[PDB]
Structure formats: C-alpha cells, structure tokens
C-alpha cells in the first residue's frame, strides 16, 4: 500500500485458533545452517508477513553457540526471514544491531528499533525505511529495553513502550510516539501499573492495547491502552483471577484490577491477550513454575471483572513440552470486515533446563483466529536434545 | 528380519472339504504376504500375493486372508491333485523370508 | 495475468511425452541440505511452474530423518521451490502447515489448502493470496484428506475434492467449490464411484476431469467430471480392462464401468489419466504388486469402452526402479491452440523396501506431451542407498 | 533515483557515533560457508547500502584458505552482499575480478573498478553498469593500486585516485575523473603530499575530501581535496599532532602541515577522517605499533592547526582486540538536511599475529554519526582462534 495505515476495524470473533506458521528451526538446524536466535515475533508488511527474532551470531551447530544463554552481547542483531523458513545464515536479513527490539510497518514503510550497549550506557536507534533516522540515549542507566514483538501504527504515529531502570523495583517506563522515525512526543507511564516489561500490542478501532510483564510483583499482567490520535495512555492490570504471568501463584477466585497480584516476586515471561469484552482470550503457560505448555482460554470480560473464569479453551503446546515467550501480531492489510487476531509462542530449547547442550535457542509456532470451532492439536518444537551430542 | 512361522506342518482333509493353513510373521507385515504352492517334484507356483490377490489363473477355491501378523490360506473342494507343500512369504521389506512349508495330505 | 482463467481450449494430441522437469533431489541431498519430502506435485502460475510437495521438517542427512515413513505429524508443511531445483532448506517457500494439500492458481492469485491435526479433529484452512481466508473443520472425524496434486479453476471457481472417513470402507467425500478462498457451495459424491482418494485433475473446455483412487475395492480408478460453471459433478470408473491402480489383479479382457474391479482390497496408489476419446493415455506402475516402474499407454476410449486395450505406449521408469505417486498438471497460461498435457511421477526412496536407511523420501520426474513421436528413455531417481551408510 | 547525484549538503554535527552494521563473518563462518575476504568497505546505492570487500576464492573452513595472507592472486574478486550478512558463497555478487578496487554509484548506476595482473603488467578495467566500459594499463609497472573504499561522484564525475610505482619511495599517483565509465580527464598528484596510498573519501558541498596513506615517510595522513566541477585538486597533510597512521611514533605537541611527520618509515594502514572545522573527527588504532583497537577523537581544526589536540572521543574496538583497515562512506540518498558521516573498521583475524591458523580473513563493524551524545560500547570481531583447530 502507499498510504498510511489507519486501524479502522475491530477484532473478528475468536472461536478457536488455526496454525498460521511453524518454523521447525531446531529440528532443521541440526543439519542445516540455522542461526541461534531467541525473543522471536512476527510482523506484517502490506506485502508479506515475516518472522522476526534476535539472532546471536552463530549457527546452532557451530562451536560459538556455546554460551548463548546470555541475553545481550554485541553479536546479537534483529533479523527477518520468510514465514515459516528457519532463520538461516543465507536467507536472513538484518534490520539492525542490538539486543532488544520492536519493529512495525506504518503502511508506507517500516520502523525497526534496536537497543544496544553496556547496561549503563545503552542506546536505541530508530531505523525508518532501512536508514537510521533518530537515536535515544539511556535515561536511567540500567538496561534500556523495549517490546520484543511488533509496535502498531495509526496514521503514521507508532507508540513504542520502553523501560529503563530496575527489573526488581521501580523503573522508568516511557511511551514514545514516533512518526516517520522522528519523535513527536513522549510520556511517562501513567496508570495503576507498577512495573512494565516486554509489552505485546495490537490495535483495533483506533486504539492500541498492550498486555505487558510485571517483573517486580505481578502474576496478573499490566495493560496499557494507547490513543495514537490524542497521544495519551492509561495503565491498569487484568482484573481476572485467571493469572497469566509465569511463574505464578495458584489462580485465586477474585483477582486485582489495580494492583499486582501477590505471590511470585522478581520474575516473569513476555505474554499477550486479546481483550475485547466477551470476545476475550488470554494466553498462559500450563505450568505455574516453568515455561512448559501453552494454552489459550476464553475468559469474557477478564480486563474488568475480578471474578472472570474461563468458558472455552485451547491447548497449543502440551505441558510435557517447552514453551517460552509469546506476543501478538495481526495482518492489518488483510482484506475483510474485521481483523484476525494472531499470536506466536517462542519454543525455547537448550540451556538451562536441557543443559546437556551448551546453547539456548528456540523455534516458532503461530496461530490466528477462526470463527469456526476447529479441532485442536498441539505443536512441539520437536528436536531430540540427544542428537546434538 | 521378519521371520515367517508356519504351524502345523502336516495337514490332512478329505476330498471336497476345506483346510486352512496358518502362517504368522514376527512383526506387522502390512498385508504383504505371498503364498506359493510346490507340487511334489515340481517348482513353486505363485498362488496369492498381498495376502488375497490370486495370480493369473489360480482358481477361486484358493483364498487368502490375514492382517497384522496373522495370515491364513484356505482351499475349498480339496482336489486329490492339491496335495503339495504350501509356503507363505513376506514381501514387505528385504530379505524376503519364507515360512517353512506345510504338507497337505488328502485323507 | 490479472484476470481470472477460463479453460477455453482442449487438449493437444498426445503422440509421445518429452521430459519437462527432473529434480535429482536424493542424489544431490546426499551432500547438500535437501528436505525430506513426499507427496510431490507441480503447479503453474501465469508466471512460472514450480515443484510443490509435502516436507517433513528435516534434511535427508540430519538425524531427525529417522522415522519419516510417517505420513502425518506436526512438522510436515506444503512447500514450493523452482522447477527442477531440489527442495532445499534455503530456496523453499512454505505455502501452509499441514499433512495433506492441494494448491492452484485461479489466474489472479493462488489458493493453497493445508489440512492438519489429529486424526479425529483435523482442520483444513484455505489460504487465498498468501493469507488465511477460510477454514473447515472435520465432518466424519477420520483423517480429513484431499488431493495431493493441484486443483483447477474456471472463472474463479476451483472445485476441490476432500474425503473424510474410512479408507477401508464407505467414507464421506465432498466436492467443495471455492472462489477467492470462500465457499460458494459444496456437494456429496454423486455417481457410481464407491470410494474417493487423492484425485488428480486437469481441465479443458470448461470441464474439470479428476482420476482418483479407490482404496477400498478398486483396481480400476474412479473418474469425477466436474462442471465448474453449473457446479455439479458425476462419478464413474474407467471402463477399460487396462487396470491402473496398484496393487492390482492381472488385467482382464472386459473391465467394469460402474463398479470397482475386484481383486486387491484396502490398498492403492495416487494416479492420473488424460481421458479424451481416442486421445486417451493412462499411466500405471509396471509392477502389479509394487511401486516400481511407470508406463504410459494409449488406450483409446478407455473411459467408456469395457474392452479398451493399449495401441501405443511409453516407458517412463524401468520396472527395475522405484516409482510412486503420480498426478497431472498443465500450463494453462502457455500460449497456443491447445493445452499440453503434463504429469509427474513421485520416485520414493527409503523405507520400507530400502530399509537399510531410516528415512523415506523421494524425487520428481515430469513429462509433457508432444505431437512428434519422440524416442523414449527412462528416468531413475538415481541414488545409491549405499552411500548413506 | 534516475538522475545524477549532486553533493548539495554539508555534514551533520558529529556528537558521538551509533552502530550501523556488524557482520560477524568469522564467528558465523566457523560453521557456515563464508568466504575469506580482506580490504572491506561499504557503499550505498540510492536503493540499499551493501558491504563490499575483496574475496579470496575459498571459504574460511576449506583447505584452500591456507595462504590467504597473500594480498593479490588471480582468485581474488570484488564482491558485494547485503548489509550485515556475512560474505557467503550463496548471497554474494561479484562486481569484477582483481585485487584492488573502488566502487561508487553516481546516482543513475554504478562504477566499479578492479585492478589485476602481475605486478609489472597490471590493468584496471572500469565497469559501468555491470558491463566493462574502459580499461587502463599500468604506467609505472609496479603494482597499480587504488582506493579500497568507495569513490564519490558529483554530477556524473567520479574522481578516483590510483598509485603505480614504489611503496617505499616516490611513486606515480594520478587522479582520474570518470563519467559514465569513460575518462574525461586525469592529472598527476599536485600538492605537498609526498606519497599516496588507499584514499578514503567522502563529498559534501560540491567538494570531495580524501584522507590517505603515506607509506613511505608519514605518520600523519595526506589529504587530497578534489573539485569534481573544475576537475582539479591540491594535497597537504593533516596539521594535527594527533598522529593517525599506524605504526606511528608517539604523538608530538606541534604537527607538520606540509611534510611527512617523521618516525616510522615504509609502513602504514588505510584510514579516514571527517575534516569539517570544529566538527572534525579522526580515527586511529589505539596501539602505536599494531592494528589493535580503534578510537575516534574529536580534534577541531586538525587539518590546519599544528597544535590541535582531542576535545571529545569514542572507543570503537578495545586495544585488547584487533582492528585493521578503516575508511569512510555516506548514504548520499538519505533524506534530510545534512549528510550522516559513517565509517567502517576492518577487523583482521588470522595470520600473522594469530598464526595458529593458516588463513588471514576479517569481519566488519560500521558506525554513523548522531547529534545525541550516545553511550559507547566496543565491538570485537568475536571469534576464538581455538575453535578452528
Ligand atoms: C476436538 O477439539 C476441540 C477444540 O479444541 C476439543 O474441545 C475443547 O476441549 C478443551 C479441552 O477439554 C476445552 O477446554 C477447556 O474448557 C473449559 C471450559 O468448559 C476450561 O475451563 C478448561 O480450562 C481449565 O482446564 C485446563 C485443562 O483442562 C487448564 O489447563 C486451564 O488452566 C483451566 O484450568 C485451570 O484454571 C481455571 C481457572 O482458574 C481453574 O478453574 C482450574 O481449576 C485450573 O486451575 C489450575 O491450573 C492452572 C494451570 O493449569 C493453575 O495456574 C491454577 O492455579 C490451578 O492449579 C479448558 O480450556 C475447550 O473449551 C473445548 N472447546 C470446544 C470448542 O469444545 C475437543 O476436546 C477435541 N475432541 C476430541 C474428540 O479430541
Ligand atoms: C525409440 O522410442 C520409441 C518410442 O518410445 C520406441 O517405440 C515404442 O516402443 C514401445 C515398446 O516397444 C511401444 O510400446 C508398446 O506398445 C504396444 C502397442 O503395439 C503396447 O501394447 C505395449 O504395452 C504392453 O506391453 C508393455 C511392455 O511391452 C507392458 O508393460 C504393458 O503393460 C502392456 O502390456 C500389458 O498390458 C496389456 C493390456 O492389458 C496386455 O495385453 C499385456 O498382456 C500386458 O499385461 C501384463 O502386464 C501388466 C503389467 O506390466 C499386468 O498388469 C497385466 O495383468 C499382465 O500381467 C507397449 O506400450 C510403443 O508403442 C512404441 N512407440 C512408438 C511411437 O513406436 C522404440 O522402441 C525406440 N526405438 C529403439 C530402436 O530403441
Ligand atoms: C558512557 O559513554 C560516554 C560516551 O562514550 C562516555 O564518555 C566519553 O568517555 C570517553 C572516555 O573517557 C571520553 O574520551 C576521552 O576524551 C578526552 C577529552 O576530554 C580525550 O583526550 C581522550 O583521548 C585520549 O585518551 C584516550 C584514552 O583515554 C587515548 O586512547 C587517546 O589516544 C587520547 O590520548 C592520547 O592522545 C592525546 C593527544 O595526543 C594525548 O594527549 C594523550 O597523552 C594520549 O597519547 C598517547 O596515546 C596514543 C595512543 O593511545 C599514542 O599515539 C601517543 O603517542 C601517546 O602514547 C578520550 O577520547 C569522551 O570524550 C567521553 N564522551 C562524552 C560524550 O562524555 C562515558 O565514559 C560512558 N559512561 C560510563 C558510566 O561508562
Ligand atoms: C486516518 O485517520 C485519521 C483520524 O484517525 C484521519 O484524519 C485521516 O484522514 C485518515 N487517513 C487515511 C488515509 O485513512
Ligand atoms: C563452552 O563449552 C565448553 C564445552 O563445550 C565448556 O567447557 C566451556 O567452559 C564453555 N564456555 C566457554 C567460554 O568456552
Ligand atoms: C469466463 O467464462 C465465463 C463462462 O464460462 C464467462 O461468462 C466469462 O465472461 C469469462 N471471462 C473471461 C475473462 O474470460
Ligand atoms: C531411529 O533410528 C535409530 C538408528 O538410527 C533406531 O535405533 C531408532 O529406534 C529409530 N527411532 C527413533 C525414534 O529413534
Ligand atoms: C548538479 O550540479 C551542477 C553544478 O555543480 C549543476 O549545473 C547541475 O544542473 C546539477 N544537476 C542536478 C540534477 O542536480
Ligand atoms: C598450508 O598449510 C599446511 C598445513 O595446513 C602447511 O604445512 C603448508 O606449507 C601450507 N602451504 C601450502 C601451499 O600448502
Ligand atoms: Ca510477573
Ligand atoms: Ca485400489
Ligand atoms: Ca605511514
């Protein structure tokens, strides 16, 4: 398309999910040249949807994959490769260098942001149209981070949530509103949310909704709802007792709309939700202590009701298999009356639970909604840690 | 390999009745069983392959059946000239393994 | 082209066949990164013809190729790669995720359908223009399957034959008529055909002819002839004594036009035929009990005559070499007075007849008609199962 | 763009640098098929920026990488691959055959020059628009060499500096002015510069500035400033006591504007500088005797002042890591009021300081200016010479 995108539709009814994309990265990367990645996501241009992830500068099999448990180094880069290919050395494309990213297409071209540097002197440079436009230095000197899933734009404005400061406390979260890679405005986190990490966002009907991570005290997730037209936001938590961070305490009967739900402290996992009244689905790990399994539950009015319990559900990865990061994306340039809600799950593999190998890496499963009620299967990464020995 | 097992080894029926030879494999052979017949002092003739498909010109009274590891060959209206050794053979994976034969005696 | 395709021509005279494409997948995949595939086929856009097949999520050489005898798993996907390249990790493109497919181009863009799931809760989602448009859940809960070769369209309507239910009995076959990835109409199998599996279709002069597989009692093949304009069909069997399923009883002298020809029970192989009066050619394995060799015989009026015997023929793979699935495709956007009939043979390699290795995989040979009478050669997959040990 | 480029802007303020591109060639090339290269650089089309380098005709891991310490052979070629991919056998594109090059885009298409041959009968052939247009034979019979970084064009004229003759003495340097791959004019080196090697150039406001290498007596660098419109030039040395060749004597307090600064004799390294009044930054190795580390220092008026000392600085590769060749490039077709100054550092790896392996090869780091003052990190090639044993 050659004109800015405007979020003029609402979600479609979510009555089950169907597979959209599957990688099989780690099973193929046992013999081919696949790159070690982590923090995946998916994002669509008007033209194509592509898988996106943070790379580690080595292939699974090469000797340099030893040590990729580590989150940030100067050999990480945000790459892109076609939907359902593995992230190969030969078909990947680097969008920028850094260890935390977000990227989105405003309708005319795309914004990609990589953050880089030492933990006390990190920088973000915002690439607009494969050229570096603006950069932002750190403001609280402690690991400036950002989304790890796509940003969303409305008429050229693309809000992006950044956090800088402790992960075990108060930190400094700001919402930036870029347009054509330039900073129109920015604001501090405002709302009842206590800490913000790795927001997963989608937009419909001119409003952007982000479901995030409270790493400091939450087991229920902060929601930030942004108005890209007035460039303002509010934050609250999901009211539902169906707790969705991980690790988590056991689900209560009454949740907490304005406060962290108490139980696990100083930990979390990136996660998403489609919050649309009765049409609300939530994703969560099946395990309470670990990144294993992944289910999607329909919990109507979960955002506002502190007694919301599931009414339909769907198993995406069995609890006997590993899951990991999850986030949302939508094909905004898909034809039709409404938007088809989609999500991805990161399937982490390697260190530290499967320490027999010295790499950590992952693969991708993505699903998108249907209105049919479709049968469910589960979707394992699939590799045998024993053939890499 | 797949080991084909035939027992009994000697069988008798009078003229006119049925007899049914049993043959059994060591693993799922997935309906790949052939039956040869070797008339005393002659060469084997292929009777049935894929457990039931009769070859060109073996009369309908010969009928193969079977599934998984258990197969069986039946002859109806036993003829005096039907006296012979019957061998079953798997044809699902190399090497092709034959059962030990069963002799039909006419009572 | 930018307008819907209409099947306005008839076949060209078939007087011998010439090689169109050869893979050499397994011989090259002994040293390069070729993916294990099975159920190949070919399909043409207005723009290019590409090889299509169901992948298994591992390369021939990697340790994960052990066990690919298995038909359906959640690591299978329908991929595409250029005519006569091997299906490489690096040049392949995933059209969808699933273990049974059909795909075709209506003239403006293309329809691809993948089916997926457990055998009792399988789903088909119909991709139109690399985006998921419609999905269909299972209707008889027992392995919803479809074509494994291209569908054919006429003015936007593309009939697709699906079967759900037993393979050893009555099953539920339906003909669906999609247009732009939406369901216009669908109907149950009507005709004298007793069971339907893996139809191979082509269209000429506004009529679509599918030659299929009777897995439950046939050795002669069901034919479905579809009218894409009135959206109706009839089914019958090929009248000819030249029996073409596999395994098969020995060819009789009089065939059976309205019934299965009796002999092999509960087995079969996908196969095709160009049925055009005196211009009729039939393909079949040379072996009666196995997928070895492949010949094409001219049997005039085979569809309607129960005494049709061959009058010309052509050997494509010697009986001392392995063959496998076959199906039809045509370049509908080729210039000229008529349509050039083409077909492909799947050359299966590996388990179970060559069990010394633990993979099953295959390569492709495709031929297209000529009016010349050309000399024949044969076309072996070519690899030595002994160099993989 | 479809019209010639004219250097109508000036530099942007350089207040720190941000990472633009990182290769990770040698760490990835331990398991993938990366080509051995050396003498890298970066150059931008209107359309994309691509990494450029001289290849050696073997991959790092293949047995033929033994001996790539050698500079020129007939298996070297100038290749191109996408920004931040490694130079792979499968995604690289050969611009020409030879062992010294320069390449630049005039706005309509691009000029690439490769030089080749025996040291006494070398030739340069100038490719314009992927076709060979003009060639130039040797004029002083002793290794005709050229830039090893991009040339710069203004209204179709692209000055290119060549040297032929001794590297340990007087040599014959000429400035050639090509347009559409044809020779408009050429002239001998004129100015106070004593020897010229491997110029790194950029253009702004209709003037092209090259910072070069005095291999015969300089430790301070020759500057050539070219007028692409009148097609004339002058040469002088950087006045600053901050000496930037390598090896070098220890920095003095008063430099030498018209003469070589005395100390190291018959050696050097390719290097660059943005010379723009107070906005002047200089690059240099941190080590005085070796290619280790790399820093950028702000030395205002360094070109003209013989007492210029640094006032701000930035560490790009630590002195405990290897650096190598450096040069300049700019995205001339980037939108905005001014030009963003960029540079690359070649990170050499292998023989001769790390002789445990038998290859010499390298990777790339590139940075571009920002006006923010951004935090600094350092950027190591990253491979462990011990995993290749
Ligand atoms: C063909 O496919 C269809 C479509 O998929 C299949 O039908 C679907 O089948 C699903 C499985 O039966 C069914 O999902 C279930 O829906 C109910 C609504 O009636 C929903 O409550 C279920 O969710 C709970 O149970 C699952 C496991 O069954 C848990 O993993 C999940 O977390 C939910 O339970 C936990 O949270 C609840 C809320 O707090 C608590 O009430 C509950 O006690 C439990 O809490 C514990 O577990 C948590 C972690 O697991 C922990 O944090 C907490 O602290 C506690 O320890 C489930 O979603 C679909 O609705 C149904 N869909 C349709 C369209 O019918 C069909 O089976 C397939 N057919 C065949 C023949 O195979
Ligand atoms: C240069 O190239 C040209 C062009 O290729 C060559 O000329 C061609 O040569 C072909 C081979 O000679 C020739 O094909 C034959 O054509 C006849 C028509 O006259 C046709 O009947 C033949 O088909 C039967 O025979 C082949 C093997 O020869 C069988 O594999 C095939 O199945 C056919 O036989 C079976 O089916 C028939 C129908 O039921 C039965 O009558 C027959 O008994 C047989 O049945 C058994 O076998 C089946 C499985 O094999 C089994 O299911 C069944 O139950 C029975 O057991 C064959 O197509 C071409 O027509 C000819 N073309 C031209 C243009 O001339 C030429 O040789 C080359 N020149 C040189 C110098 O090399
Ligand atoms: C967050 O990031 C920011 C931004 O990066 C950080 O702030 C920056 O920090 C830099 C390091 O402190 C600072 O750079 C320094 O700036 C001064 C200006 O005040 C400049 O003089 C420094 O350059 C000299 O020192 C470095 C090492 O410190 C040398 O490698 C360099 O060559 C310079 O010294 C040599 O040359 C000079 C000129 O001749 C001589 O006076 C000096 O004696 C020395 O000579 C010897 O060394 C040479 C080879 O090394 C040799 O050839 C010669 O013969 C002699 O032997 C340096 O650039 C930035 O200005 C500052 N920037 C900003 C915006 O503040 C901050 O630290 C980070 N924060 C945290 C919390 O980590
Ligand atoms: C996009 O939306 C804004 C209001 O949200 C409207 O003013 C603008 O004209 C729209 N433009 C397009 C191309 O839809
Ligand atoms: C990497 O793995 C090896 C064994 O493969 C281990 O002993 C070593 O400590 C690990 N770390 C590094 C930096 O080598
Ligand atoms: C295609 O065929 C239908 C009838 O089969 C006709 O009505 C229609 O106009 C045709 N369109 C084109 C573009 O050929
Ligand atoms: C795979 O192959 C191995 C030998 O390569 C065999 O022993 C094993 O049972 C096979 N199956 C699996 C799941 O490993
Ligand atoms: C480029 O610059 C020259 C003078 O330097 C001027 O005469 C010419 O018209 C310019 N052309 C374009 C397309 O800018
Ligand atoms: C190349 O390397 C080998 C050892 O790998 C060395 O002994 C030999 O001299 C080197 N040079 C050549 C031309 O082989
Ligand atoms: Ca939490
Ligand atoms: Ca059949
Ligand atoms: Ca020097």
PDB file of N, CA and C and ligand atoms in Angstrom, chain A residues 3-4 6 154-155 229, ligand 4:
ATOM      1  N   UNK A   3      -0.016   4.388   1.350  1.00  0.00           N
ATOM      2  CA  UNK A   3      -0.679   5.376   2.169  1.00  0.00           C
ATOM      3  C   UNK A   3      -0.651   4.927   3.595  1.00  0.00           C
ATOM      4  N   UNK A   4      -0.672   5.811   4.593  1.00  0.00           N
ATOM      5  CA  UNK A   4      -0.549   5.378   5.992  1.00  0.00           C
ATOM      6  C   UNK A   4      -1.665   4.428   6.453  1.00  0.00           C
ATOM      7  N   UNK A   6      -4.566   3.007   8.931  1.00  0.00           N
ATOM      8  CA  UNK A   6      -5.453   3.525   9.969  1.00  0.00           C
ATOM      9  C   UNK A   6      -6.202   2.353  10.489  1.00  0.00           C
ATOM     10  N   UNK A 154      -0.999   4.135  13.685  1.00  0.00           N
ATOM     11  CA  UNK A 154      -2.311   4.611  13.259  1.00  0.00           C
ATOM     12  C   UNK A 154      -2.066   5.992  12.694  1.00  0.00           C
ATOM     13  N   UNK A 155      -2.190   6.152  11.396  1.00  0.00           N
ATOM     14  CA  UNK A 155      -1.992   7.401  10.674  1.00  0.00           C
ATOM     15  C   UNK A 155      -0.570   7.981  10.744  1.00  0.00           C
ATOM     16  N   UNK A 229      -4.131   8.865  18.362  1.00  0.00           N
ATOM     17  CA  UNK A 229      -4.641  10.136  17.798  1.00  0.00           C
ATOM     18  C   UNK A 229      -4.443  11.291  18.787  1.00  0.00           C
TER      19      UNK A 229
HETATM   20  C1  LIG E   4      -6.550   8.192   9.113  1.00  0.00           C
HETATM   21  O1  LIG E   4      -7.253   8.527  10.351  1.00  0.00           O
HETATM   22  C2  LIG E   4      -7.258   9.904  10.754  1.00  0.00           C
HETATM   23  C3  LIG E   4      -8.058  10.002  12.067  1.00  0.00           C
HETATM   24  O2  LIG E   4      -7.778   8.921  12.947  1.00  0.00           O
HETATM   25  C4  LIG E   4      -7.902  10.731   9.606  1.00  0.00           C
HETATM   26  O3  LIG E   4      -7.980  12.118   9.918  1.00  0.00           O
HETATM   27  C5  LIG E   4      -7.060  10.525   8.327  1.00  0.00           C
HETATM   28  O4  LIG E   4      -7.562  11.373   7.297  1.00  0.00           O
HETATM   29  C6  LIG E   4      -7.055   9.019   7.926  1.00  0.00           C
HETATM   30  N1  LIG E   4      -6.290   8.830   6.676  1.00  0.00           N
HETATM   31  C7  LIG E   4      -6.390   7.738   5.900  1.00  0.00           C
HETATM   32  C8  LIG E   4      -5.564   7.667   4.626  1.00  0.00           C
HETATM   33  O5  LIG E   4      -7.180   6.826   6.182  1.00  0.00           O
END
